[PDB]
């Protein structure tokens, strides 16, 4: 019953942080956003840009999704993001993550009315 739009916000939007590399940000955020409940989600990307800018990506360059579907969109601009990757030693319920801040274009799937992001598909260096 949680909307995909809301799920996408929960899993992928963190507008106001600027994590440091190999800091504790992913450990915190992966737990806070409920992605270590019952398992440690292996990899996840947070976007540090106003929700609006991510939402407007739905009107930008239309591209193919990783699954061949055609409702994917690539940001006109690079965006601050952070990649959270589970460490090798990690065993649920201890879920420890590497935090990797970077700047990349993002690609999202959009659906619905309003036409908004429902899936974070990829990021690319371009």
UniProtKB/Swiss-Prot annotation:
It comes from the Eukaryota. It is an enzyme of class 4 (lyase). Its main location: secreted. Pancreas and other tissues and body fluids (indicating it may have other physiological functions besides its role in digestion). Changing residue 88 to A: Substantially decreases binding affinity for RNH1 but maintains high conformational stability. Substrate binds at residues 7, 10, 41-45, 66, 85. The keyword rRNA processing does not apply. N-linked glycans are of complex type. Disulfide bonds join 26-84, 40-95, 58-110, 65-72. Glycans are attached at residues 34, 76, 88. Residues 5-25 are annotated as: Disordered. One of its GO terms (molecular function) is lyase activity. Its EC number is 4.6.1.18. Residues 5-15 have a biased composition (Basic and acidic residues). GO terms for biological process: defense response to Gram-positive bacterium. One of its GO terms (cellular component) is extracellular exosome. It is found in: Secreted. Changing residue 89 to D: Substantially decreases binding affinity for RNH1 but maintains high conformational stability. The keyword Nucleotide-binding does not apply. Keywords: Disulfide bond, Endonuclease, Glycoprotein, Hydrolase, Lyase, Nuclease, Secreted, Signal. The active site is at 12 (proton acceptor), 119 (proton donor). Monomer. Interacts with and forms tight 1:1 complexes with RNH1. Dimerization of two such complexes may occur. Interaction with RNH1 inhibits this protein. Endonuclease that catalyzes the cleavage of RNA on the 3' side of pyrimidine nucleotides. Acts on single-stranded and double-stranded RNA. Belongs to the pancreatic ribonuclease family. This is Ribonuclease pancreatic. It comes from Homo sapiens (Human). The gene is RNASE1.
């Amino acid at each position: 019953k949680e909307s995909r739009a809301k799920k996408f916000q929960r899993q992928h939007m963190d507008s106001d942080s600027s994590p440091s590399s190999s800091s504790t940000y992913c450990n915190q955020m992966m737990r806070r956003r409920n992605m270590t409940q019952g398992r440690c989600k292996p990899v996840n990307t947070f976007v540090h840009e106003p929700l609006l800018l991510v939402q407007l990506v739905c009107l930008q360059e239309k591209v193919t999704c990783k699954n061949g579907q055609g409702n994917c969109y690539k940001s006109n601009s690079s965006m601050h993001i952070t990649d959270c990757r589970l460490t090798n030693g990690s065993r649920y319920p201890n879920c420890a993550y590497r935090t990797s801040p970077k700047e990349r274009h993002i690609i999202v799937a959009c659906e619905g009315s309003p036409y908004v992001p429902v899936h974070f598909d990829a990021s690319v260096e371009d």
